[PDB]
Amino acid sequence: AWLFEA
Amino acid sequence: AWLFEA
Amino acid sequence: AWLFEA
Amino acid sequence: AWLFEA
Amino acid sequence: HMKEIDELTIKEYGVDSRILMERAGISVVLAMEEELGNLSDYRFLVLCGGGNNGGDGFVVARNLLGVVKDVLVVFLGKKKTPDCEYNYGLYKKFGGKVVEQFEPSILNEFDVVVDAIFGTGLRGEITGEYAEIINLVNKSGKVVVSVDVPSGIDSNTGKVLRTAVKADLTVTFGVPKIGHILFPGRDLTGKLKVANIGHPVHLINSINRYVITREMVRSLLPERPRDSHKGTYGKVLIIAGSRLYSGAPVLSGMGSLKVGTGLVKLAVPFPQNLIATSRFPELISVPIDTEKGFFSLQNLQECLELSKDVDVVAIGPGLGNNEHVREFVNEFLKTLEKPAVIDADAINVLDTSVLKERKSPAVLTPHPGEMARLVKKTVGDVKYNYELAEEFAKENDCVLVLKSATTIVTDGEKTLFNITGNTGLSKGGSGDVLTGMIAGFIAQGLSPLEASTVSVYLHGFAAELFEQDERGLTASELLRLIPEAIRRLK
Amino acid sequence: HMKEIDELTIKEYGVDSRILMERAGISVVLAMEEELGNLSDYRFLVLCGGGNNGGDGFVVARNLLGVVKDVLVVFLGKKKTPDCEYNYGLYKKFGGKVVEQFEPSILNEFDVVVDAIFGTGLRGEITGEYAEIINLVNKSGKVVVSVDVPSGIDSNTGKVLRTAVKADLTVTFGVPKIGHILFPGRDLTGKLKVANIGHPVHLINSINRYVITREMVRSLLPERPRDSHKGTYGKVLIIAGSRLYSGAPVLSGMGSLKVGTGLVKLAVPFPQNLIATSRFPELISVPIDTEKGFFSLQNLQECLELSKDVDVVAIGPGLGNNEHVREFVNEFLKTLEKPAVIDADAINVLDTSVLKERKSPAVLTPHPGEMARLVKKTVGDVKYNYELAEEFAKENDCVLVLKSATTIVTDGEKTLFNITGNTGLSKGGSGDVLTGMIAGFIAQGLSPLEASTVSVYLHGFAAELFEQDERGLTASELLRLIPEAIRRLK
Amino acid sequence: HMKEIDELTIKEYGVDSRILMERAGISVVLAMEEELGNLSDYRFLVLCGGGNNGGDGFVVARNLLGVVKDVLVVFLGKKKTPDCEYNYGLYKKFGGKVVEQFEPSILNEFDVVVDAIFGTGLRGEITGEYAEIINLVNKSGKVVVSVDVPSGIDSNTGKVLRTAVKADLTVTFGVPKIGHILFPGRDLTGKLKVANIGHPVHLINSINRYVITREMVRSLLPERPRDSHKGTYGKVLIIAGSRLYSGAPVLSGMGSLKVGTGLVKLAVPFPQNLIATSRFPELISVPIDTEKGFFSLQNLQECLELSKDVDVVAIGPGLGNNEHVREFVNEFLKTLEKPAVIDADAINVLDTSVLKERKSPAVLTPHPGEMARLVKKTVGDVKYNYELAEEFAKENDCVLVLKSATTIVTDGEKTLFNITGNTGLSKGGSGDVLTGMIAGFIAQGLSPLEASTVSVYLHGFAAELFEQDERGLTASELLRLIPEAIRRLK
Ligand SMILES: Nc1ncnc2c1ncn2[C@@H]1O[C@H](COP(=O)(O)OP(=O)(O)OC[C@H]2O[C@@H](O)[C@H](O)[C@@H]2O)[C@@H](O)[C@H]1O
Ligand SMILES: Nc1ncnc2c1ncn2[C@@H]1O[C@H](COP(=O)(O)OP(=O)(O)OC[C@H]2O[C@@H](O)[C@H](O)[C@@H]2O)[C@@H](O)[C@H]1O
Ligand SMILES: Nc1ncnc2c1ncn2[C@@H]1O[C@H](COP(=O)(O)OP(=O)(O)OC[C@H]2O[C@@H](O)[C@H](O)[C@@H]2O)[C@@H](O)[C@H]1O
Ligand SMILES: Nc1ncnc2c1ncn2[C@@H]1O[C@H](COP(=O)(O)OP(=O)(O)OC[C@H]2O[C@@H](O)[C@H](O)[C@@H]2O)[C@@H](O)[C@H]1O
Ligand SMILES: Nc1ncnc2c1ncn2[C@@H]1O[C@H](COP(=O)(O)OP(=O)(O)OC[C@H]2O[C@@H](O)[C@H](O)[C@@H]2O)[C@@H](O)[C@H]1O
Ligand SMILES: Nc1ncnc2c1ncn2[C@@H]1O[C@H](COP(=O)(O)OP(=O)(O)OC[C@H]2O[C@@H](O)[C@H](O)[C@@H]2O)[C@@H](O)[C@H]1O
Ligand SMILES: Nc1ncnc2c1ncn2[C@@H]1O[C@H](COP(=O)(O)OP(=O)(O)OC[C@H]2O[C@@H](O)[C@H](O)[C@@H]2O)[C@@H](O)[C@H]1O
Ligand SMILES: Nc1ncnc2c1ncn2[C@@H]1O[C@H](COP(=O)(O)OP(=O)(O)OC[C@H]2O[C@@H](O)[C@H](O)[C@@H]2O)[C@@H](O)[C@H]1O
Ligand SMILES: Nc1ncnc2c1ncn2[C@@H]1O[C@H](COP(=O)(O)OP(=O)(O)OC[C@H]2O[C@@H](O)[C@H](O)[C@@H]2O)[C@@H](O)[C@H]1O
Ligand SMILES: [K+]
Ligand SMILES: [K+]
Ligand SMILES: [K+]
Ligand SMILES: [Mg+2]
Ligand SMILES: [Mg+2]
Ligand SMILES: [Mg+2]
C-alpha cells in the first residue's frame, strides 16, 4: 500500500 | 462436556 | 499445558 | 528485479 | 437462584465453601486457556472485590502464579468475606502481588483483565472508583474475562447498574443466570461458559427457568411414521389479512407448511385471498366476502364452520384494528372450541375476559408494543419482564410468547428463554412466519407450550442459516431456510 | 487541483521539483513491472512532449537504460521546461538515444509504448504530428502505458480533445484526476494506479471531490445491535405506480428491504397494489383508490396520513406524468415534513420552487434525461457536468444523485464519484431499485448524502456479482445480489 | 568503492546528490514493506547520525509520516552534512518530531528501529552515547533495519569497530559492500537487499570484487555434448594419502567424479589404496610402494609417469608432513607440466619458489591455518584478508582459494566471494571433496579461476541441500548431494 493505491 | 456447557 | 504435563 | 537484488 | 443452590450444597450436602471457591477459580483458568491457547505468554490483571466474586478472583490469580508472564491483583474492596480473606492469604503466601490503588496507566502493562469485582452480590448503582475502573477497562482494548457475571450486570434482570464491564468471555458457575440471557446483559457477557463446580446434579436440574437448547428441541420434534398421510400431520386454519395487509396470510400459511403440517387453509377477504395461491399453490386460500375489506361479525358464522374441520386456528396477522374487527375477533374466540394462536391485530383488539372464559387453550404471541397495549403499561415496563409474562399466562390460562431478541415463552409455571436468531428477523413478516410455525406444531400434536418452544428456536436458527448478510434476510427467504434448520437439528 | 498541490509541495514545503519528477518516473517503472512482470525482455518506446509530462517520461526512459532490451525516446516537443531539459540531459549522459522524427514503422520494433506526451498541461485540440502519432499508437496493438493521464484526455472533465491515447495502464500521481473517473476518459485510462510521489498527506487529503471506495462504504454501513426490532431499522413509504407502470413499486420496496430497512409500505393505485404482495408478501402494499389509475389531488390527504408514521418517503417511480400527477406531487412535497427521495416521474413534474421552500431534506435521483428536462438544458450539457450538479444541489438545498456509468453524488459542498456497476444496470428497473436503497438507508439513520453514497456503490457492486453475462442481469436478480454485496463489503 | 561511484554519478553524470538520497530512503521504505507487510500498523524509531547515512534516515522518516502509526527521529549527530540538513528540514516541515536526547525507555514505545547512524563514513571505534544506544537497540528485541551497513561494521573489512548494530534487514545501495560479505559483518547484516538508486549500470558493473551468484555459476558449467565419451570430460590424477590418512584420497576422487569428470586415478600408498575401490569401485586406485607408508623421492618417477596421461593433478590430502614428503612434493611440482591443485599437506610443505618457477598453472586451497603457515603470519592476520590473498596470487602466479565460511577466490586481478554453505562443512573431509571438485572442473576445460568459482559455490550449495540437521552432515553425504546441487543450478 505505501507506493500505490489500486 | 464434564466441566463446561457451551 | 496448565493442568497436565504429558 | 528492477529495484532490488536479493 | 444459585444462592439457594450454593447454600444447600455447603450446609446440607457438606461441601466446604472453600472447595466450591477453588473449583470456581480453576474453571476460570481452564476456560481462559481454551479461549486464549497457552497462557504462559500473557500478563494478567485481576480486579478483585471484597466479596466471594473477588475470592474467586484470588484463586484465579494464585493459580496463574509462576505459570504466566505476570500476575497483579488490584484489590478494590474494603472488607473481605471469610473465603475471600482465605484466598487473599493464599495468593500472598504463594508470592502474589496485590495493590489497593489503581492508576489509569496500569492497563498498559497487561494483556488480560480478569473481572472479579462484583458477581451476584451487586446491589445498587456502581459509582466512584469502581465505576472509573470499569470505564477504564472498557476503554482499554484488552481481553476481558468476567468471573460469574460481568460486574455491573444485575444477574436477575440483565440490566446495567449505571455501568458495567464488557467481557469477551464470562465464566459462570452451575447454571446461566438470567442476566446473561436478557439484554443488555447478554451483550456484555460475550462468550458464555457454564462451569460445573461440584453442585449435586439434582439441584442444578431443579431450576424452573431454562434456556431452550438444541437437545431440548430435538427431543420435542414430532415423529414422522412412514405409514402416514396428511391428516396424520394436522390441519390449520389461519384467519388473517385485509385489503390493507394482503401479505400476512401467505407468510403465516407457509410457516405452518414448512414445519411439516399436513393441511393449511387461509380465510382471507376477497380478492386478497388470491395472492396466497399465486405465490404458493399448495395453500388453500378461501375467499371471504366482506363489506369494506375487513373481517366483521358478517363473517363469524362462515369462520366457525371452517373451524370445525381443523385442529388449530391462528388469528390476527394483517386483520386491521377497527371496531368491526374487534367485534368479530372476540365473538369468534369466545365461541371457538379449538386451540387458538392469537397474534398481531387479534391481540390489539382482544378482550382478555374472553381468554379466561375459554375452555380450549391459547397461545399469544405479542411483541413488547402489543404486550404493553394489552396490559396497559409502557414498553419499558414489559420488555424482558419475565415475571409479568408469567403472571399474565397464569391469570389468563394461556401460553405467552413475548417476542424480542431474547424471546420468553411461559405458561406461568415453566419459563423458557430463546437465544437463537439475529437482526435479519428485525423486519416485517418474520412474526407472521412464527405464528404459522406455532399453529403447525400444535396441529402435529405438540402442546401449546412445546409448540412455542420448538418454533421460537427453529425460527431464530433458520435466520442464522442465511448465507448472506443478515440485514438482507426477508421472510420469504426465512421460509426457505426452515427445512434446513430442521435437518440440522437432527 | 494537483497543480496547487505540486506548487505548495515545492514552494512551501521545499521539496525540489526534480525530486518529485524522479519519484514520478520511478513509480511508472515499478507499476509497469507489477503489470508486465520482469521488464528485461521488453523493448520500450517512450514518447516525450516538451513539458513536465515529458520530463517524467525522460526519467522513465533513463531508469530503463541498461536494464531492458531496448529503449528509444521520441521527443515530439519544441521547447523543454527546466525539469524536462534536466532529465533529457540525464537520459543522454546515461547513454540514451533520442530521435525527433517519428516514422510510421517505428512501432514495429518495440513492445511497449510509454505515453509521456501530454498530461494535465494539455490545452485545446490535439492536431498535426501529435495527432498522427497518437493515432498510430492506437492502431499498433502494443502495450500502452500512459504517464499521469492518457494524452488527449482533459484531466478536469474526461473529454477527448480531438484524439487521445488508449492506454492499458495509466499511472497517475497523488490523487486520481476527474478525467480518469468520467467517460470517455475512464475508458481510455485502462487500469489506473495512483502513485505516492512524496506530497504531504495533508495536502493529498484536502481534495474535496472523491471516488467512493469500499473502505468509505464499510465505515458508513449502519450498526445492527443485537437487541433491536424492526422499528430500530426505520420505516419507508413509497408512493409509486399507476395502471400503466405496475412493476416499479415492487422493485423500489424490495430495494429498501434488501438493505436492512425494518418496514416498507407502498401506496399504489388499486388493483396494481396487489402485484407487489403477490411477488413479495413481506411488503405492505396499500391500495389507493383513483379515478383513472393515476395519483391525483384526491389522494393527497390519504398519502400525508400514511406519511406521519414513517421516517422517509420515496416518490416517483411509475407515477406517470400528466397534470393531475403534477398537482399531487408538488402539493404533497410542499406539505410533507419528512425526508423525501424524489425520483423518475416525480422529478419530471417537480416544481423546483417547492424544493427551496421545504424545511425537510430531499434527495433527487435523475438520469441525464431527467436532469436535462429539470434544468431546461440538453442531455449533452448536463451529462457528467459535476459543476452544474453542485450548483443545483447548493441552490435547491438537496442532494443530487446524477445517474450514469459514473454516478455523481453531491450536496453542493462535497462531491463523490461512483465507479462500481456494469452494463447489466442499463435495463429498465435498476433505477427503481436504487431509489428504495437510498430511502432505506435514510430510514436506518444515515444522512441523505451518506445514504446516497452507500447506495450507489452497493447497487453497482451487486451488479458485478452477477454470475452470468452482465447483459442478462435483471432488476429482480440485482435485488437477490444486494445482501451478498453487503457481506462482501464486510 | 561506491564512494567513487556516487561521486562520478553526481559530478560527471549530473545526478543531483539529493535525488540519490531520495531514492536511497524510499528503497528502505519499500524493502521494509516487502519484509513486514503493511507498514501502517507499526511504530518506527529512526536513529539518524549527522552524515549522509542519517540524511538517508531523514528521508525514510519523512516518507513514513502520516502513513504509519508513529514515527520519531532521534538525532544523535552534532553537525549535519548539506543533504542531511536538507532532509532534516523536510522532515520537520512535513510535521515530523525529532529529539536529540535518547532515554533507555524509548525503545518501549516502538516496534521497528531504523538504524541510520553510521554507514560507509564510520571511522574508528564507536564509543560514548553512540555505543550505548547501539547496545540498547541490540538488547531491545525490536525489529532492526539498517540503512546501507549496520552501524559499527567497517564496510571494507566486515570488522566490528568496538560495537555494532545487529540488523534483521539491511538495505544497501548499488552493490553489496565487503562488510556485508565477510564475518562478523555478514552475521550482523541479517537479510541483505541491494537497491538500485539510479547509478549508471556501467559504473555498477565496473566493481572488480564480486559475490559468486547462481547465474554466474550456471553460465560457467561446462557443456555436455551428446556425442561424447569419458575422454571428453578429462582425466584427473590425485596423489594423496598415507598409512595415517587413508580416507582423504577417496573423498577427493569422488569429488572429481560427482562434478562430471571422465576418469579419476588415485596414487595412494599400498595397501591404503584398496580402501578407495572397496568404497567406490568406479575409482582407479593405483598402489604406490613406499618404505614407511608415506610418499618420498623413491616415488617421484612413478608419479610423473602417471601424470603424463592426465589433464590435471591434485596433490596433498592426507600425505602427511615429514621431510621425505616435503622433498617429493617440491620436486614433483617443479617437474610437473600440468595444472596442479595443491591442497592440505602439500601446502604445508610447499616451497613457494617452486610455484614461481612453474610454467603450468596452479590452484592453492588453504584454510587460514595453512595460509598462516605458508606466509609466516598469524591466523588472525590472514583470515578474511582478501588483499593479502590477492598479493599472494599475483606474486606467485596462481589462483588462491582461501577457505572459510565466506571463501575468497582470487587470481590477483579478480576476486570472488562465496557465501553458500553452512556449518555442516565444519567437519573433517569437506576440504578433501572440494579439492577433487576443482581438479575435475579443470579437467573438463574450465580455467583454474573458473573451476574454483564453480566448485566453491556448488560445494556450499550441496551442503545446504542436506535434509536433516546440518551438524550431522558428513563428507560422504555431501558427495551424494553434489549432483542435486548441479540439477538445481539448471
Ligand atoms: N453497587 C455497589 N457498589 C459498591 N460495592 C458493592 C455494590 N454492590 C455490592 N457491593 C459489594 O460487593 C461485594 C459483594 O459482591 P459479590 O462478591 O458479588 O457478593 P457475594 O455474595 O460475596 O458473592 C457471590 C459470588 O461468589 C461466587 O459464589 C460467585 O462468584 C458469585 O458471583 C460486597 O463487598 C458488597 O459490599
Ligand atoms: N423487540 C422490541 N423491543 C421494544 N419495542 C418493540 C419491540 N418490537 C416492537 N416494539 C414496539 O412496538 C411498537 C409498535 O409496533 P406495531 O404495533 O407493530 O406497529 P408498526 O408495525 O410500526 O405499524 C404497522 C404499520 O401498518 C401500516 O398501515 C402503517 O404504516 C404502520 O406503520 C414499536 O415502535 C416499538 O415501540
Ligand atoms: N434482533 C433480533 N434477534 C432475534 N430475533 C428477532 C430480532 N428482531 C426481531 N426478532 C424476532 O422476529 C419476530 C418479529 O415479530 P413481530 O414483532 O410480530 O414483527 P413483524 O413480523 O414485523 O409483525 C408484523 C405485523 O404484525 C403486527 O405485530 C404488526 O401489525 C406488525 O407490523 C419475533 O420472533 C422476534 O422475536
Ligand atoms: N493541444 C496541444 N497541442 C500541442 N501541444 C500542446 C497542446 N496542449 C499543450 N501542449 C504542450 O504540451 C506541454 C504541456 O504538457 P504537460 O507536459 O501536460 O504540462 P506541464 O504542466 O508541463 O506538466 C504537468 C505534468 O507534469 C507532472 O506534474 C505530471 O506529469 C503532469 O501531467 C507544453 O509543451 C505545451 O505547449
Ligand atoms: N446515462 C445516460 N446518458 C445519456 N442519456 C441518458 C442516460 N440515461 C438516460 N438518458 C437519456 O434520457 C432519455 C429519456 O429517458 P426516459 O425519460 O427515462 O424515457 P424512457 O424510459 O425511454 O421512456 C419511458 C417509457 O414508458 C413507456 O410508456 C414508453 O414506452 C416509454 O418508452 C434517453 O433517451 C436518453 O436521452
Ligand atoms: N453502463 C452502466 N454502468 C454502471 N451503471 C449503470 C450503467 N447503465 C445504467 N447504470 C445505472 O443503472 C441505473 C439506471 O437508473 P434509471 O436511469 O433511473 O433507469 P431505469 O431503472 O430504467 O428507470 C425506470 C423508469 O424511471 C424513469 O426514469 C423512467 O420512467 C424510466 O423508464 C442508475 O443507477 C445508473 O447509474
Ligand atoms: N567512530 C565514530 N564515532 C562517532 N562518530 C563518527 C564515527 N565515525 C564517523 N562518525 C561520524 O559519522 C558521520 C559519517 O557517517 P556516514 O553518514 O556513514 O558518512 P558519509 O560519507 O556522510 O555518508 C555515507 C553514507 O551516505 C549514503 O551514501 C550511504 O548511506 C552511505 O553509507 C559523520 O557525522 C562522522 O563525523
Ligand atoms: N575457517 C577458519 N578460521 C580460523 N582458523 C581456521 C579455520 N580453519 C582452520 N583454521 C585454523 O587452522 C588450525 C590448524 O588446522 P590443521 O592444520 O588442519 O590441523 P588439524 O586438522 O586440527 O590436525 C590434523 C589432525 O591429524 C591427526 O594426526 C591429528 O590428530 C591432528 O589433529 C586450526 O586450529 C585453526 O587455527
Ligand atoms: N561454517 C562454514 N560455512 C561454510 N563453509 C564452511 C564452514 N566451515 C567449513 N567450511 C568449508 O568446508 C571446507 C573445509 O576445508 P578444510 O578446512 O581443508 O578442512 P578439512 O576437510 O577438515 O581438511 C582435511 C585435512 O586437510 C588438511 O587441511 C588437514 O590435514 C585437515 O585435517 C572449506 O571449503 C570451507 O570453506
Ligand atoms: K465479575
Ligand atoms: K500522458
Ligand atoms: K547504518
Ligand atoms: Mg407481528
Ligand atoms: Mg428511473
Ligand atoms: Mg584440508
Kindly write down the DSSP assignment for every residue of E99-122, as one continuous string: ES---GGGGGG-SEEEEES-STT-
Query: Can you give the length of chain G in residues?
Result: 490
HSE of E398, CA atoms in CB hemisphere, 13 A: 22
d(C-alpha E346, C-alpha E288), whole Å? 17
HEC assignment per residue over E51-105: CHHHHHHHHHHHHHCCCCCEEEEEECCCCCCHHHHHHHHHHHHCCCCEECCCCHH
Pocket perturbation via mutation, ligand 6, pick of F426, F452, F457, F477 by most ligand atoms within 8 A of CB: F426
Nearest to G31 by CA among G230, G190, G209, G215: G190
Taking alpha carbons only, the member of G47, G103, G104 closest to residue G75 is: G47
**What is the crossing angle of helices F323-335 and F300-308, to 10°?**
30
Distance E268 CA to ligand 9 centre (A): 97
Distance of alpha carbon G490 from alpha carbon G488, whole angstroms:
5
Nearest to G106 by CA among G82, G81, G70: G70
Tell me, yes or no, whether F405 and F448 share the same domain.
yes
Q: Which of E207, E227, E256 is the last residue of a domain?
A: E207
Report which protein residue has its CA nearest ligand 2's atom 16.
Answer: E369
**Angstrom distance (rounded) from CA G286 to CA G204:** 51
Q: At what angle do helices E17-36 and E2-11 cross, to 10 degrees?
A: 130
Give how far A1 is from chain G: nearest CA, Å. Answer: 7
Phi/psi-derived region of residue F141, left when phi > 0, alpha when psi is between -120 and 50, beta in every other case:
left
Nearest to G239 by CA among G99, G150, G338, G119: G338
Nearest to G264 by CA among G302, G301, G306, G222: G306
- Cα separation values, F377 from F50, F374, F412, G94, Å: 39, 8, 19, 47
d(CA F1, CA F6): 9
Q: Prior bond to F361 cis, omega within 30?
A: no
Per the CB < 8 A criterion, the answer to whether D1 and F40 are in contact is yes
- Closest by CA position to G303, among listed G234, G357, G237, G235: G237
| Pair G174, G229 in one domain | no
Which residue among E238, E345, E365, E403 has the greatest number of ligand 3 atoms within 8 angstroms of its CB, and so is best to mutate? E403
Axis crossing angle, helix G248-258 with helix G475-488, rounded to the nearest 10: 10
> Is F431 in contact with F402 (CB distance < 8 Å)?
no
Q: How many CB atoms lie within 10 A of CB E196?
A: 16
The C-alpha cell of F63 is what? 531508469
> Are residues E327 and E258 located together in one domain of the fold?
yes
d(CA G144, CA G162): 19
Rounded Cα distance between E67 and E81, Å, is 27
Instruction: Enumerate the residues of chain G whose CB falls inside 8 A of the CB of residue D1.
Output: none
Among candidate residues E10, E26, E13, E92, the one with its CA nearest the CA of residue E59 = E26
Tell me how far apart the alpha carbons of residues F184 and F149 are, in angstroms, rounded to a whole number: 12
Residue F162, CA distances (Å) to F115, F129, F153, F384 in order: 17, 13, 9, 18
Residues in chain G with CB shorter than 8 Å from the CB of D2 are: 196
Chains touching chain A at 3 or more Cβ pairs under 8 angstroms? F, G
Residue pair F164/F187 in contact (Cβ under 8 Å)? The answer is no
Task: Check whether F428 is labelled as a binding-site residue.
Answer: yes
Cell numbers placing F397: 438545498
- The string of DSSP codes covering F360-392 is S-EEE---HHHHHHHHT--HHHHTT-HHHHHHH
Q: Chain A interface residues facing chain F, Cβ-Cβ under 8 Å?
A: 2-6
* F113 plus F241 within the same structural domain: no
Q: Which residues contact E369 (CB under 8 A, 6 or more apart)?
A: E379
Whole-angstrom distance, CA of residue G332 vs CA of residue G352: 13
- What Rg do the C-alpha atoms of chain G give, in angstroms? 26
Q: Within 10 A of E378 (CB to CB), how many other CB atoms are there? A: 9
Q: Which protein residue has the closest C-alpha to ligand 6 atom 23?
A: F431
Cα separation, E441 vs E257, in Å, equals 10
Residue pair F458/F414 in contact (Cβ under 8 Å)? The answer is no
F305 in Cβ contact with F265 (< 8 Å): no
Q: Which of G207, G236, G255 is the last residue of a domain?
A: G207
Q: What single-letter amino acid sits at F438?
A: I
Answer whether F389's CB lies under 8 Å from F417's CB: no
CB E192 within 8 A of CB E406: no
Q: Burial, E178: exposed, middle or buried (Cβ in 10 Å; 0-12, 13-18, 19+)? A: buried
> Does the CB of F480 have a partner CB in chain E at under 8 Å?
no
Q: What is the DSSP letter of E37?
A: S
Chains with 3 or more CB pairs under 8 A to chain E: B, C, F
Sequential DSSP letters for F278-344: HH-TTSEEEEE--SSSS--GGGHHHHHHHHHT-SEEEE-TT---SHHHHHHHHHHHHH--S-EEE-H
Q: Name the residue range of residue G487's domain.
A: 208-490
Report DSSP state, residue F141.
-
Distance F319 CA to ligand 14 centre (A): 11
CA distance to partner chain G, nearest, from residue F23 (Å): 8
The closest residue, in CA terms, to atom 10 on ligand 8 is: G369
Judged by CB atoms closer than 8 Å, whether chains meet at D3 and G194 is answered as: no
Same domain, E310 and E187: no
Q: Is G429 helix (H, G, I), strand (E, B) or coil?
A: coil
| Cis-peptide, bond into residue G483, ω within 30° of zero | no
E445 shares a domain with E435: yes
Cα separations in angstroms, G448 against E130, G435, G436, G460 = 82, 12, 13, 18
E437 alpha-carbon distance from chain centroid: 17
Domain boundary (E207, E223, E257) is at E207
Q: Is residue G183 within 8 Å of residue G385, measured between CB atoms?
A: no
Chosen from F19, F27, F86, F204 to mutate, greatest number of chain G CBs within 10 A: F19
Buried b (16+ CB within 10 A) or exposed e, F198-233: bbbeebbeeeebbbbeeeebeebbbebeebbbbebb
Number of other CB atoms surrounding residue E228 within 10 Å: 11
Place of cell 491457547: E37
CB neighbours of residue E382 within 10 Å:
23
C-alpha cell at E126: 456502581
Same domain? For F110 and F187 the reply is yes
C-alpha cell recorded at residue E152: 455491573
Q: Name all chains with 3 or more CB-CB pairs below 8 Å to chain F.
A: A, D, E, G
* Cα–Cα distance for residue pair F353/F350, rounded to 1 Å: 9
Contact E373, E355 (CB under 8 A): no
User: Cell numbers at residue E66, please?
Assistant: 509462576
The residue whose CA is least distant from atom 12 of ligand 2 is E369
Residue E86 grid cell: 482465605
- Given the C-alpha cell 407457509, which residue does it identify? E254
Torsion of CA E320, E323, E326, E332, to 10 degrees: -110
Place of cell 459514473: F406
With contact defined as beta carbons under 8 Å apart, do F96 and F71 qualify? yes
Contacts of G134 (CB under 8 A, 6+ apart): G117, G126, G151, G152, G163, G164, G165
Distant-in-sequence, close-in-space partners of G387: CB < 8 Å, separation ≥ 6: none
Contacts of E419 by beta carbon, 8 Å cutoff, 6+ apart: E181, E186, E211, E212, E406, E460
Residue G16 sits in the same domain as residue G143? yes
Cell numbers that stand for F314 in this block: 420515496
Instruction: Answer whether G441's CB lies under 8 Å from G450's CB.
Output: yes
Q: Using an 8 Å Cβ cutoff, are E125 and E161 in contact?
A: yes
E310-to-E304, E331, E337 alpha-carbon distances in Å: 10, 19, 11
- Is residue F279 within 8 A of residue F251, CB to CB? The reply is no
Task: Give the DSSP H/E element, type plus range, for residue F265.
Answer: strand F263-269
Residue F232 contacts E where some CB pair is shorter than 8 Å: yes
What backbone torsions phi and psi does residue F238 show, to the nearest 5 degrees? -115, 120
Same domain, E377 and E313: yes
Question: Is residue F384 located within the same domain as residue F443?
Answer: yes
Structural contact between residues F76 and F70, judged by C-beta atoms closer than 8 angstroms? no
Instruction: For residues E305 and E402, state if they share a domain.
Output: yes
Q: What is the resolution of this structure in A?
A: 2.1
C-alpha cell at G8: 562520478
E140 and E212, same domain (yes or no): no
The contacts found for E480-488 with CB under 8 angstroms, 24 or more apart, are E482/E255, E482/E258, E482/E259, E482/E437, E482/E458, E483/E258, E485/E458, E485/E461, E486/E221, E486/E259, E486/E260, E486/E458, E488/E461
* Cell numbers given for F66: 541498461
Q: What beta strand segments (E) does F411-466 contain?
A: 415-418
- The CA R_g of chain B, rounded to the nearest whole Å, is 4
One-letter amino acid at F5 equals I
Q: DSSP code of F222?
A: P
CB-based contact G160:G130 (threshold 8 Å): no
C-alpha grid cell, residue F149: 493521464
SS3 (DSSP) at G18: helix
Grid cell for residue G172: 544497501
F56 within 8 A of F147, measured Cβ to Cβ? yes
- Give the number of residues written for chain A: 6
Q: What is the atom index within ligand 7 of the atom nearest the CA of G125?
A: 1
Side chain identity, residue E124: G
Count Cβ atoms below 10 Å from residue G275 Cβ, excluding itself.
17
Q: Give yes or no for residue G81 CB within 6 A of ligand 7.
A: yes
Residue G437 to residues E123, E273, E355, G225, G249: CA-CA distances in angstroms?
86, 95, 102, 20, 13
Of G451, G21, G486, G416, nearest to G181 (Cα)?
A: G416
- Rounded CA-CA distance F323/F349 in Å is 8
Q: Collect all residues with Cβ–Cβ distance below 8 Å to E421 and sequence separation of at least 6.
A: E405, E407, E459, E460, E461, E463, E464
Question: Which residues on chain E are in Cβ contact (under 8 Å) with B5?
Answer: 193-194, 196
Cell of G355: 610455484
For residue F288, the cross-strand partners are F269
Distance CA E266, CA E479 (A): 17
Give me the CATH number covering residue E30.
3.40.50.10260
Pairing of strands G399-402, G312-315: unpaired
Contact (CB, 8 A) for E160 and E188: yes
Residue located nearest, by CA, to atom 19 of ligand 5 = F369
Asked if E228 reaches chain C (Cβ–Cβ under 8 Å), the answer is: no
Q: Is F403 annotated as a binding residue?
A: yes
Judged by a CB distance cut-off of 8 A, whether residue F29 touches chain D is: yes
What amino acid occupies position D6? A
Residues in Cβ contact with G360 at an 8 Å cutoff, skipping those fewer than 6 apart: G336, G337, G338, G339, G340
Q: Which residues of F touch D2 (CB under 8 A)?
A: 29-30, 33, 39, 63, 67
What CATH number did the domain enclosing F479 receive? 3.40.1190.20
Are the C-beta atoms of F290 and F269 separated by less than 8 Å?
A: yes
- The one-character DSSP state at E153 is B
What is the 8-class DSSP label of residue G413? S
What's the distance, CA F26 to chain centroid?
29
Numbered residues of chain D with Cβ closer than 8 Å to any chain G Cβ: 2-6
CB atoms within 10 A of CB F9: 25
**Sole residue written with cell 416485517:** E428
Number of domains in chain G: 2
Distance CA G328, CA G267 (A): 13
**How is residue F57 written as a grid cell?**
517520461
Pocket residues for ligand 1 (CB within 6 Å)? E 6, 49-54, 56, 77, 81, 118-126, 130, 147-148, 173
Out of G186, G374, G379, G434, give the residue to mutate to test ligand 8, the one with the largest number of ligand atoms within 8 Å of its CB.
G379
Look-up of cell digits 494539455: F122
Quote the crossing angle between the two packed helices E448-464 and E475-488, to the nearest 10°. 110
Residue F73 in contact with residue F104, Cβ under 8 Å?
no
* CA gap G165, G132 in Å, rounded: 11
Residue F153 is classified by DSSP as B
d(CA E276, CA E273): 6
